[PDB]
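worker-03 picked up job from queue 'complexes'. Input manifest follows; three sequence lines, order preserved.
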Amino acid sequence: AAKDVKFGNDAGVKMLRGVNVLADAVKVTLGPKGRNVVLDKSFGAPTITKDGVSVAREIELEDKFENMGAQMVKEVASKANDAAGDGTTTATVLAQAIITEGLKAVAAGMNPMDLKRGIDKAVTVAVEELKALSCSDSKAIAQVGTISANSDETVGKLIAEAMDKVGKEGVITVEDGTGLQDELDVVEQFDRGYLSPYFINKPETGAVELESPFILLADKKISNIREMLPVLEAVAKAGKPLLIIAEDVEGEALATLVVNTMRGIVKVAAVKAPGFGDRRKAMLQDIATLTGGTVISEEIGMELEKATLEDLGQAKRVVINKDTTTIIDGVGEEAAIQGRVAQIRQQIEEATSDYDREKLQERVAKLGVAVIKVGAATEVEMKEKKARVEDALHATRAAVEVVAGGGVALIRVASKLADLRGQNEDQNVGIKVALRAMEAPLRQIVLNCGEEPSVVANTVKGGDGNYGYNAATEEYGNMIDMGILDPTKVTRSALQYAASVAGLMITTECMVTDLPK
Amino acid sequence: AAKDVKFGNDAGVKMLRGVNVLADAVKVTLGPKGRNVVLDKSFGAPTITKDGVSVAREIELEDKFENMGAQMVKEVASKANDAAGDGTTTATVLAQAIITEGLKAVAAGMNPMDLKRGIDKAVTVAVEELKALSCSDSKAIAQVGTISANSDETVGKLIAEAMDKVGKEGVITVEDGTGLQDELDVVEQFDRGYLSPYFINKPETGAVELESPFILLADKKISNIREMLPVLEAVAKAGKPLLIIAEDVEGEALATLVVNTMRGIVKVAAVKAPGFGDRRKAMLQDIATLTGGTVISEEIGMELEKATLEDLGQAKRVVINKDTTTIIDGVGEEAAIQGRVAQIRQQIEEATSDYDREKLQERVAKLGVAVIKVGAATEVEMKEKKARVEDALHATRAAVEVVAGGGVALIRVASKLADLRGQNEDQNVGIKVALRAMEAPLRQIVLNCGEEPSVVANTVKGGDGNYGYNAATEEYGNMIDMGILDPTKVTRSALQYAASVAGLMITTECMVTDLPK
Amino acid sequence: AAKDVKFGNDAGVKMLRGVNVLADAVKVTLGPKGRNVVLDKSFGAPTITKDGVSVAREIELEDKFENMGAQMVKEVASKANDAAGDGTTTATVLAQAIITEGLKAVAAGMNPMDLKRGIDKAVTVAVEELKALSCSDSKAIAQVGTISANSDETVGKLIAEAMDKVGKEGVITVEDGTGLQDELDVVEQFDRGYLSPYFINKPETGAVELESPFILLADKKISNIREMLPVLEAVAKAGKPLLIIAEDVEGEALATLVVNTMRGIVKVAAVKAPGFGDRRKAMLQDIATLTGGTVISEEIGMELEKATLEDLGQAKRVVINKDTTTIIDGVGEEAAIQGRVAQIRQQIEEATSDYDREKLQERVAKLGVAVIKVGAATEVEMKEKKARVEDALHATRAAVEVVAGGGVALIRVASKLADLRGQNEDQNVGIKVALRAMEAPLRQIVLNCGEEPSVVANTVKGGDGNYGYNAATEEYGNMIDMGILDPTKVTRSALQYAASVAGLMITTECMVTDLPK
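worker-03 finished. Artifact:
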């Protein structure tokens, strides 16, 4: 359709307004004194939140261009959430700060490209400086978990031990307990999410759950639909849920499965094979050995139509997040899986490239799941405990993949980079833009407290090291001694993502959108 | 869709107007001199009420933001109604008073967080002070019941004895009498309501009633629909009504059942299993023993499809309120149920944690229903008597879960807390905001009488103890001697819920809603 | 949807306008000199009436609030019509008068509650005073009947004898004659109307007529539809009409029957069982004995599906009014019915409570119908005679359940209550409001004549006793000697209903309605 095009400054103003609308709505929920935000529910009473992520999801503007700006900075929160699993609001306040001052410098005549270069330089030097000041050990892992579950020491300990058993990389799932106590057991996960939403049968978690499903392993991309019908019929009996782990399921057959899940029971859930090219099919073999199935390869491609339930692997349970699929308890234990492990473990011995050995080591490391059965007290208490552990786990994993909290770490880092220079004046301005934005988080936390940000900032900048401002007690002191910590992971992730999106927007010279007319 | 966002004061004004529209409409019906409110019926003559709850349900505003405020304070009434079962209008007048003065203090510059803290402190000290001045014994239980049934001593006595027989926790139901007199008999209830409305075949009571229904007990969450079809067909003969007490019925299979109840007879009604985790399935076993059925567990999950009518328990009648399900007269009396009781009663002896014993004690306490057959006079008189006992019972249960009425209790409590202070000025203001709101109920009762609230309030505050103002006779005197009492339960519940919702609104800094454009 | 709320005066004005629009339109048809009102027919020539009830039914206003007021006062006419069966226009003029002056006093500052109390006091003292001045005997019954049939002495006599044969409580029906003369015969009725309209196959009478229908007697509430299908099929042959006298037919199965009556022949008509609780089912047994059927009780509930035509009672004819169902000529005469009478007649001997004996006496009194075959002259004359007797009967029954007419009775009553006082000034004002309204009827009758109401009123108030104004001859004199009488029943009913609705409106402080926007 007819488009609307805006260049330079005209496009810059529309972007700035859009980011301000989103950022302002989000930033009010920062810190222990974060204010509430009312999100109008389609039906019933409105939602009350202090959670930034929840607020951002609702932000969409009428002005096509402003909305573009809001959707661009919304990428900061989502990316930081996907990486660190926390600190999205901090990322949003940092992004806005860099964009605000960045665009103002552009309007002043500064070179967009130079500005970006200066900002990027400040961020690289900042992250390394952040490392110097610095969630690896179980002490920290247990400390983060408890914090994520309202100081519940029980939950933090369960997570720490869970990660200590299967490694801070292994698959971990939370299940219901069987009469009090807290159980932990490894009962025999790849980076692939559902090819399309809607498969999400549990909207609250944004994940797909399948109980005792069959797993169709294919080495080709499904698009034909029709030749899949005979396999679907076979799965329609007993094991209702079906998990398709093919090379890829094209929009053709994929759209058919999506339309079939609606109304027609649980049906099927589709994801793509882990890895690519050569290692893709060898990786599929590992899944086949776990689940006890047969991979329908190129030559067996004709067989895709006459694939019996014997060729379909099976598992006790499977959970598919946005970008992670975990197969819990596969059917083909010991003998099969262990023999597979013996082969690959012998592959590393066949010394070739150091690369191969690393990749093969990842495979043997993958071939079980560690289930955490929660404290089964009464009935409702067990449901809450599971809700606590579930959220606390998710937050700890992101925290794993500490520095003084309250935004003092970034301020302390900015003080060190005061002499940082670039190749020119514009690059120097960009550097200072980044350093001024590193004060934004603390200033916003203080602003929400009802105190003057300029004063508190000045005082903390006057202090040294872990000297910061406790927004909870309205008192200054040693942040770490007061227990106000931030994983170095969430802090650097928030800064890096804020700077990348901000860098893109500052480098933008033209915007195109469908005309309202 | 595109949203509309408002911050601070802009959002505060919209909220205040919304709460004022709801509160003002509701508060006119407070006390013995409560005014009428006309609710326009879609068809026929408009509804005339002095019942606050009925009025609030109709309140919905055009301005998206104002409506948000109205729906927020509407939560006070609903929560207080769910807890105390009375005093919703009092709760609404208290909420408005706290919100009005709270937001005004915010606009004046006060710190929202500090204000909330002061209010909360005043409420905690107030409730304990309220306890000092203080529906446990049967005297009070019988006194409340009569009051709920227009001074009908007959009804109050039936309820008092009913609660004395199965305990003020046990299940009680009202049925039709068999030729005059008033019968009471325990004929062999968990906190779970219908997973979705529409199942409510009796709109007047807001509950679901099933006569001689089959009870499908499952230990897994239903979502497949299809595998439920064979069981539904079996129930389609003889025992038309079906009650599904599964771990949970997901929106998939749930939505199918909801669409099937419409037009297709009574069909099925769904609720979730009592408790959670470990005790959930042990609790299901107790229901299975009562109804004489078999619980379809994890392993028996495949059997869910081939579950015969022999596995389905059965009862004489079942009533499902918003948050309570009561199974009246199960089929499997004596032997089965009594043996089950013997096991659990022997579990408490096996001393482990004091916790377990408490939970196990709750189970043995649960394993009958006490039916109240009303005074069967003529025909229509019996219908009214049942209507009286039914409402009087509901109000008494909430009253169970006394202080001077006429809003004098809260005023007397506020006088004691005159020296209450906080950590700062803002916290002191919040405290006073709460104390000024404690006069609202009496002032509103007097306002409806046509008398000057400031004068009557001043006079009662000048008195001592139970000295209050009788709004019915327009005379001052000892409230308790005049028979104007209020259950301490309804009073503290009204104050606590008013303060919580008010605390949230005062802490709100941003509102988001779908744009009208 | 979004609502519109109005308080106090704002709501009072909207109500007053609405009542004025309805009352003014209605009151022009009062008395012998009543003016005509044109009611626009959807198709064809407009309706011309001097009948107030017909006019009121058409009144509906655009302004949501004003319409609420009109629909509220419309309740006066309908209630008085249901009780006295006449005097609706008088009731409407009384209501308007009380509401007009009542609301004006409220706006003046008077206390709404006090006002209501004064009005109520004036009405109670007025009705007893009305009794002192006072359709029991057959003389009056015959006098009212003739008056209702245009002075046709024939009709008045038939009704008087009909009521003398089965009592002024017994069931009476009008049928076509068989060759001149006027027959009267008792050929072997409960307070229950059709559960839903639409069943009304005769719109002109607002009643349902069934010829030789089967009667399904059930002791449970039907809602299942499906289990009723087999019984409906059995009735689909021969005896097309079906009458369901169950405990109650819930909206589920009820809505299905309503949709089936449309297009699908006469089908079924549903009503609920007479009485409630214990006496409900004993009362059903009495109907079963009359019609010669079997009552499907609780235990026989399963049999509801396999209920043969043998279990269905049968009658010659059945008529279901708004609130009355009459079974004409049941099949099971003498032996069956007489034996049933012997049991209950022996129940009264078993002296227990005086209450039981009264209720049992009502049952034996109920166990026939008195048919009135009209003067069969030519063909068309017989149709008119039946139309006369039918209307004259209906009016006489209401008249049974005399004082000077022309509104002089109420004026004479108001003169006596001139010294009536209350507990305060506001209560005294309310009293006077009621006394001034008692002149409204006469003033309106005179106003329609074209004469000055203030003058005629003054003159009648100057007279004594039955001294009144004959609006027909435009002459003063003794009302009773002139034959202008009013049943004390219609007069007190008109006043009481006018005062009750007026009391509610004056006590109204808030109105809520769906927003036009």
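worker-03 released lock.
Chains A and C do not touch (no CB pair under 8 Å).
Chain A is about 50% helix and 15% strand.
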